[PDB]
Design a protein around this nucleic acid. Structure first.
Ligand SMILES: [Mg+2]
Ligand SMILES: [Mg+2]
Ligand SMILES: [Mg+2]
Ligand SMILES: [Mg+2]
Ligand SMILES: [Mg+2]
Ligand SMILES: [Mg+2]
Ligand SMILES: [Mg+2]
Ligand SMILES: [Mg+2]
Ligand SMILES: [Mg+2]
Ligand SMILES: [Mg+2]
Ligand SMILES: [Mg+2]
Ligand SMILES: [Mg+2]
Ligand SMILES: [Mg+2]
Ligand SMILES: [Mg+2]
Ligand SMILES: [Mg+2]
Ligand SMILES: [Mg+2]
Ligand SMILES: [Mg+2]
Ligand SMILES: [Mg+2]
Ligand SMILES: [Mg+2]
Ligand SMILES: [Mg+2]
Ligand SMILES: [Mg+2]
Ligand SMILES: [Mg+2]
Ligand SMILES: [Mg+2]
Ligand SMILES: [Mg+2]
Ligand SMILES: [Mg+2]
Ligand SMILES: [Mg+2]
Ligand SMILES: [Mg+2]
Ligand SMILES: [Mg+2]
Ligand SMILES: [Mg+2]
Ligand SMILES: [Mg+2]
Ligand SMILES: [Mg+2]
Ligand SMILES: [Mg+2]
Ligand SMILES: [Mg+2]
Ligand SMILES: [Mg+2]
Ligand SMILES: [Mg+2]
Ligand SMILES: [Mg+2]
Ligand SMILES: [Mg+2]
Ligand SMILES: [Mg+2]
Ligand SMILES: [Mg+2]
Lengths: 64, 149, 204
RNA sequence: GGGGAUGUAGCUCAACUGAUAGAGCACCUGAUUUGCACUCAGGAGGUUGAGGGUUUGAGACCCUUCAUCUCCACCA
RNA sequence: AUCAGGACAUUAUCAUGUAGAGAAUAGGUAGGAGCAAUCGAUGCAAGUUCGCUAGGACUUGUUGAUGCGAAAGGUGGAAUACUACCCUUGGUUGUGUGCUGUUCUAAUUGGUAACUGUUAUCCAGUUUCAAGACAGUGUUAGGUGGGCAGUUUGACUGGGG
RNA sequence: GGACUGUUUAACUAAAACACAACUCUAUGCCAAACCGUAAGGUGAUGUAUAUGGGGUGACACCUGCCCAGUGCUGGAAGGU
RNA sequence: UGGACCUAAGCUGAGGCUGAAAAGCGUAGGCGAUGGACAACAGGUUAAUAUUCCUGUACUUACAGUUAGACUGAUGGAGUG
RNA sequence: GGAGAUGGGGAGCUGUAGCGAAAGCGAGUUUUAAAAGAGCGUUUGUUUGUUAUUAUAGACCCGAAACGGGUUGAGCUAGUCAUGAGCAGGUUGAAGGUUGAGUAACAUCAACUGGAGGACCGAACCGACUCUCGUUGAAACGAUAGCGGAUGACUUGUGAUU
RNA sequence: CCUGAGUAGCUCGGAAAACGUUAUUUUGAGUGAAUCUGCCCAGACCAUUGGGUAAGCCUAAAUACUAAUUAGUGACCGAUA
RNA sequence: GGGUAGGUGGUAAGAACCUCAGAUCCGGAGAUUUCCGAAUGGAGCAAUCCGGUAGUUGGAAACAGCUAUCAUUAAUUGAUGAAUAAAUAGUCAAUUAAAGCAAUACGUGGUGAAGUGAAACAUCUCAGUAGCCACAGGAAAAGAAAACGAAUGUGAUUCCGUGUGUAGUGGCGAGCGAAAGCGGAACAGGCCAAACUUAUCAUUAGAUAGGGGUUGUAGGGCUUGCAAUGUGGACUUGAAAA
């Protein structure tokens, strides 16, 4: 599914309000961007993750 | 964001320094190439206290790099004979990492980011030149021979 | 929803955020939680009332009461004639199981209450199953004969030990009283009257 | 409902930022051919959109309006 | 990462500037008395704008004593040594980012080829080739969009239209 | 009238209707255009412009005239919004 | 005649990919005849069965013992099918 | 407390002072410079039982064509795919080839062979153009008599699939 | 010295609360703090006053329902109910 | 165990038996429990077909009886091990759990319409209802203030009445409609992280296992003393009683 693998945060369903306040259901998708990390002997394994976790990954020194 | 760098780089800094470089060149180029390091001891004042150990850590990794240079300089026996038509068809088809199928594990590691060889990796049937850079001052010259099995 | 592999993700970070929230290290605390809660008290500086509050717990616990029942009994006694600091003492000591324990045929007050609820207990103008009826100073409480048919007998002995405000004859299973317990028979475990004024604020 | 800019020969336009209005076209005349145009040059055609304010010096700078335009806004 | 250029936009300096008049091409304003002069003048030499070929100016050396008539004639709203600050523009170094044409690879992409898991057209890993900070994807904002959906399309009327 | 052989409204219309070989225009250089899905995946096609998809006309023979004002499509410097 | 033999269209499909969820796609494997391979014919009999029961004459595939000869040769390659 | 009448429970609700948008004033208050004028007030309650009407619920009953959401259907039929089967019988006699003539050599002609055709006639088979009958029928679409195709863009069995 | 940071805030689209999006709560995209003389709140917002300690976890009771077991009840039905 | 003099289930008579060494019958505890079905050795058109492995008994073997076992996923452990030296991917084995169903009922979460009303209709309502899906539990959810809110104020959550059809919110239309306060049912508050410290990891620990701590009239840690050995729980095993 279109979801992060580090966390479990997925899509957010909401309304597409326009002029005249017409209601149409729309979907916000999370920023799944490929990322490689070093875990368990630095083993790199491509993992589709949200940009938020990527920023979290960058500051936490893991990403090097 | 703040990054300390290890080796000598044409821009930014020389040996120790603190540079504010974008993460693209830092997290993708400077870090995997051991040209830089993240926040030392996780802060700035922590970095200042640990620099009195970072100097000697840089000395000893340079020292082991010199040890790595002697090990490759004592053998120069990385041999490979190609299987081809031979007379009109001469070219090394080992790419580059087949030669590293004879360095890492069997002998001195000689990592993929360490050997600054050209993109032709040798295409001759005679003695050639391998250049490897442990640091920004040491130049490695290897002479491998080639031929037909 | 797949091979979540908690090892793969947990080790993947080693600190992050989710691991530490979840950190299997999570112990049991299955006794720390219960016991300390249990029941507390002490006196403080800013509200004063701390002493009053703690005394209520002790007083309520001495008879095994839930706070709601206490509010009912206080409401009843509050309105009558006047300075009733002699009435509510009789009301609080008029519990049937309290009288049964103070009568001396049970090792402990709660055991007497259990007995009462289990139908050991015979009264005068009535009979009794519920261990909460408010009794009148001069009433008799003839004990059943089935209970003596189950000789554990150890009880009768406690009965004679007694305290002066109760007059009960051993073996013969009979009891009454007069001259309701004075404050001496209500020892210094809980002897104060400003918790009483507190209940007028909390209970109208 | 604001914000900006424009207004000059009849027309199309320079605007001659104050030390005192000009060009092409419209029109008159002259030259100009066998004729028609074409062509060349003079003259005529200006109260500077209007009013007010300031300097010794404003069509020109300030204020106020008029008309036009482009923008935005523009759920009674 | 990066090369330059231009975008996001326009960066820093003094010269320079004729309304006429006025030894003056005055764009200014005041201030300020005497000033150049080894706190060495002068002049030509020559670089240059410029032409109302006058003037703006000068630079440097010439150099060894002329000076400064832009002290002081001089007219001017405008000015007459000297001190400041007052501006368009030639001049000063910039262009950080993106972009605009570029180069590079490590992000990323591949329905190039090879090996392995593996007796396996998928998938995964490792390469190789081709791209490459593009593309694709997410969020935001314009344009087109009966492909699709929800609705509207009045009343009187010698029937209705 | 349709070139023809054929196809069509099971259960009121078999025809001049549809289709057909053929003509022309348009898009598409391959991870092609187009299409099903939300996407993966797949058809196109294990094909490669002598190929594929779409619009129109409908053997064969001779012809197909004028208009680019409006609309549609393609391209375009700068300029205005 | 069909299974214990084999595959076509197609179905299912560990891993895996994709997708708010349910699920969709799909590899290796497994199913799936309307096809391929495989040894029995004639006559008689009961009210009802007969290449099945009976008579007559045959054929095929396994296992063990035995005799003689021979080195045996597939989960793979090739031909045929 | 008996699945009770009821007792406790005054939390609250209505009335007791109104006027003004409101702060605010008060038997007065709002407007207004105003006290004048005008508007509103300067009193008649509450809780139940019964009846009538009314508001929210489907609200006196029956009736739509519809709309949205979920499942079941390609055993009929339409298309596609896989594997099989069928077209009695009788005619016409193409391309091509061989030979001979002919041509400078072609072209062309004659004979023989060959058996092609979205070829012809006509049964099974497929389809349904016409008259009549039937129309609560034998039949929720047929019967008799004719009719078109009938080696193909054919007909059909089984299996799968949209 | 320690007191929970891609966190609280802020911007762009949505929502929860009675509220048709707004002080408070939440989040798809982007950015991003401080550390008890600290931070949040008292319907925009600022100052004073006051209240409370976010970004960690668990929590009985009163509350919702009856397919079933036992006992029982009905100004409920009595074969078109 | 209770309890008897009858019993062999109904349409059901008869035939034939059992039963006073205590039958039939009722209650508690056990035994057996074919096949399909989550179905799980493989398949498959459900109640069918085809097996493997390790034993054991007959046979001269094929074979045939009689037993036990053989699905997948996840976690742990161990062995083996690619591209490619190491190492993983992968492979194998063992152990432990998960699958499914139903109570036409309650809970949480995700997704989520339309008929209808507004006398049309698009904002809105219907309605976060129906439906679809996931996870339970015997209830679930919620929960201990970075709170209410205007005061010499209350002091987790939940449920009932009132506050009121009030303040408000609405093409200000149809409509929608609390939060305080008050009266009641019940009542309970606990525990980690960080400081500081101990032991161990090529101690590059930034990791593991312990002591210390859980806050607002700020709490805790650092150093130094007094008083304490208790009271109470949402708590384990037992024994006894009702
Ligand atoms: Mg709606
Ligand atoms: Mg593909
Ligand atoms: Mg990009
Ligand atoms: Mg858009
Ligand atoms: Mg439209
Ligand atoms: Mg429409
Ligand atoms: Mg509607
Ligand atoms: Mg009408
Ligand atoms: Mg009419
Ligand atoms: Mg025809
Ligand atoms: Mg026909
Ligand atoms: Mg018909
Ligand atoms: Mg017909
Ligand atoms: Mg695709
Ligand atoms: Mg293909
Ligand atoms: Mg074609
Ligand atoms: Mg046509
Ligand atoms: Mg035609
Ligand atoms: Mg044109
Ligand atoms: Mg165009
Ligand atoms: Mg089979
Ligand atoms: Mg068959
Ligand atoms: Mg027969
Ligand atoms: Mg009452
Ligand atoms: Mg009056
Ligand atoms: Mg009355
Ligand atoms: Mg069909
Ligand atoms: Mg023929
Ligand atoms: Mg024919
Ligand atoms: Mg805030
Ligand atoms: Mg709402
Ligand atoms: Mg504070
Ligand atoms: Mg805190
Ligand atoms: Mg009935
Ligand atoms: Mg009847
Ligand atoms: Mg017995
Ligand atoms: Mg509607
Ligand atoms: Mg309506
Ligand atoms: Mg719970």
């Amino acid at each position: 599914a279109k979801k992060d693998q580090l966390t479990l945060r997925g899509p957010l369903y909401g309304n597409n309000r326009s002029h005249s306040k017409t209601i149409t259901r729309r979907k916000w998708n999370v920023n799944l961007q490929p990322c490689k990390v070093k875990t368990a002997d630095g083993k790199t394994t491509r993992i589709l993750v949200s940009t938020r976790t990527l920023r979290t990954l960058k500051k936490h020194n893991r990403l090097s | 964001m703040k990054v300390i760098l290890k080796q000598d780089v044409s821009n930014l800094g020389k040996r120790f320094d603190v540079v504010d470089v974008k993460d693209g060149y830092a997290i993708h180029f400077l870090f995997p190439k051991k040209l830089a390091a993240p926040l030392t001891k996780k802060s700035l004042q922590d970095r200042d206290l640990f620099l009195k150990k970072q100097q000697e850590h840089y000395e000893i990794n340079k020292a082991l790099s010199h040890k790595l240079k002697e090990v490759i300089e004592q053998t120069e026996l990385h041999f490979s004979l190609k299987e081809h038509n031979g007379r009109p068809y001469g070219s090394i088809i080992t790419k580059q990492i087949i030669n590293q199928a004879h360095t890492k594990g069997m002998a001195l590691q000689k990592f993929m980011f360490k050997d600054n060889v050209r993109l032709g990796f040798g295409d001759h049937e005679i003695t050639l030149h391998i250049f490897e850079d442990t640091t920004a001052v040491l130049k490695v010259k290897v002479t491998p021979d080639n031929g037909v099995k | 929803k797949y091979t979540g592999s908690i090892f793969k993700r947990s080790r993947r970070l080693g600190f992050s955020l989710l691991e530490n929230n979840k950190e299997f290290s999570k112990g049991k605390k299955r006794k720390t939680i219960p016991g300390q809660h249990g029941n507390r008290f002490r006196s403080s500086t800013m509200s004063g009332y701390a002493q009053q509050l703690q005394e209520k717990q002790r007083m309520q616990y001495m008879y095994g009461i839930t706070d709601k029942q206490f509010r009912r009994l206080f409401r009843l006694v509050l309105k009558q004639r006047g300075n009733l600091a002699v009435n509510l003492f009789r009301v609080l000591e008029s519990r049937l199981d309290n009288i049964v324990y103070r009568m001396g045929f049970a090792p402990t007050r709660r055991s007497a209450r259990q007995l009462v609820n289990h139908g050991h207990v015979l009264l005068n103008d009535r009979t009794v199953d519920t261990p909460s009826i408010i009794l009148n100073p001069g009433d008799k409480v003839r004990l059943k004969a089935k209970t003596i048919k189950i000789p554990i007998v150890k009880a009768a002995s406690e009965s004679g030990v007694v305290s002066p405000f109760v007059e009960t004859n051993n073996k013969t299973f009979e009891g009454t009283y007069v001259r309701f317990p004075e404050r001496s028979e209500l020892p210094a475990g809980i002897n104060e009257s400003y918790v009483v004024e507190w209940y007028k604020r909390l209970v109208k």
